[PDB]
Design a protein around this nucleic acid. Structure first.
Ligand SMILES: Nc1ncnc2c1ncn2[C@H]1C[C@H](O)[C@@H](COP(=O)(O)OP(=O)(O)OP(=O)(O)O)O1
Ligand SMILES: [Mg+2]
Ligand SMILES: [Mg+2]
Length: 380
DNA sequence: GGGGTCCT
DNA sequence: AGGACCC
């Protein structure tokens, strides 16, 4: 049996901004990227603003909305890493999911604490936060005890995140990653909940669409929908044989297990990132001249990042998106270029990126690009 | 939107 | 190199 916590920061980008400019802490705030409000603080959500909503919709429904620009992710990324490092201090196995979510495997920590316990104050063990579905605790049930100690650790985590980084968030504690992530959002914002095993089925059947299961995305949901599968129960009861043939043995067996609340995937230590990338989207790029300036701009940003990181990238990738869905070209970085960080690495790197660009884009015939991205990977 | 992961 | 997933 495992004890897993999922930590999910409240309106992360908005929190980072409200900390940067505390004069926003009291007003409805929205963080904008191009024409989207990607996230907003809880005051704005109260005024009917939704995640990933159009700035037109948002401006009309809530003309008092204060917008800050969140296209440069630098500060969010930096705070994101402070959070996971703080969690890694609790237990070293921490898996990041995007910038604002972490899983921690607490089972070793829980076991250590229980061993230190006397029967005197084992009486006595208490929950911190909400119990999912108001389920009764059985102090004689060792699984219940282990999960409650988890909720205590989770509370210490949220307290340290607030006290040391100024950030609030939710936590969900359960026996695997799927359930911990489903349960962490039951009470929001800035609260936590623990899932006892006999409420597992209640949690999974509380979902309304199979897309709400982590692991089942747009494409997979579409296939399932095609098969007449709509509820969690539908997926639970659909023919394994048929499903296996429709989506392949790997996806079928995995997602069908997910529909019963079963997930044996380990919490993986994320550690340092395996790639660095920067991108810009735009309405139109139809010339190599600006394509180069664009790319130079991105390359500038990236180099600062590999600079302070330490490790060195052994491959570059250039990515594009044409009008009306992405294409990419990569190649190893010349060994001599790799030794760069106090000379002029720009020019030779731009040279390589442009060769890659022309290989993928016919510059002798009109082109219409709508995104450019540069990615460094294969770090050593 | 502006990132990131892993598998095939 | 592309596809699928996550935020
Ligand atoms: N398709 C997408 N789904 C989810 N998030 C996305 C997507 N595209 C970009 N993002 C970015 C923008 C959001 O600010 C952030 C998602 O954070 P998420 O944990 O879903 O909620 P949140 O931190 O905004 O608020 P809360 O956790 O309080 O609901 O990631
Ligand atoms: Mg969040
Ligand atoms: Mg999903």
């Amino acid at each position: 049996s495992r004890v897993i916590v999922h930590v999910d920061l409240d309106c992360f980008y908005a929190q980072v901004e409200m900390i940067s400019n505390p004069e926003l802490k009291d007003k409805p705030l929205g963080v904008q990227q191009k024409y989207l409000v990607v996230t907003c603080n809880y005051e704005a959500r109260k005024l009917g603003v939704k995640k990933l909503m159009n700035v037109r919709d948002a401006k009309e429904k809530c003309p008092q909305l204060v917008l800050v620009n969140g296209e440069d992710l630098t500060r969010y990324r930096e705070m994101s890493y402070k959070v996971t490092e703080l969690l890694e201090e609790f237990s070293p196995v921490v898996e990041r999911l995007g910038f604002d979510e972490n899983f921690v495997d607490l089972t070793e920590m829980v076991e250590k604490r229980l061993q230190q316990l006397q029967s005197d104050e084992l009486s006595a063990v208490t929950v911190s936060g909400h119990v999912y579905n108001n389920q009764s605790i059985n102090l004689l049930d060792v699984l219940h005890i282990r999960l409650l100690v988890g909720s205590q650790i989770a509370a210490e985590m949220r307290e340290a995140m607030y006290n040391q980084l100024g950030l609030t968030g939710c936590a969900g504690v359960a026996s695997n990653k799927l359930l911990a992530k489903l349960v962490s959002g039951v009470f929001k914002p800035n609260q936590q909940t623990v899932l006892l095993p006999e409420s597992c089925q209640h949690l999974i059947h509380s979902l309304n669409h199979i897309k709400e299961i982590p692991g089942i995305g747009y494409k997979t949901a579409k296939c399932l929908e095609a098969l007449g599968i709509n509820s969690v129960r539908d997926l639970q009861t659909f023919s394994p044989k048929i499903l296996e043939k429709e989506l392949g043995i790997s996806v079928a067996q995995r997602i069908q297990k997910l529909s019963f609340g079963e997930d044996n995937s380990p919490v993986i230590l994320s550690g340092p990132p395996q790639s660095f990338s920067e991108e810009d989207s735009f309405k139109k790029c139809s010339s190599e001249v600006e394509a180069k300036n664009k790319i130079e701009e991105l390359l500038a940003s990236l180099l600062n990042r590999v600079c302070q990181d330490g490790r060195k990238p052994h491959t570059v990738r250039l990515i594009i998106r044409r009008y009306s869905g992405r294409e990419s070209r990569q190649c190893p970085i010349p060994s001599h270029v790799i030794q760069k960080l106090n000379y002029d690495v720009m020019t030779p790197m731009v040279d390589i990126l442009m060769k890659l660009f022309r290989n993928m884009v016919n510059v002798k015939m009109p082109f219409h690009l709508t995104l450019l991205s540069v990615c460094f990977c294969n770090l050593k």
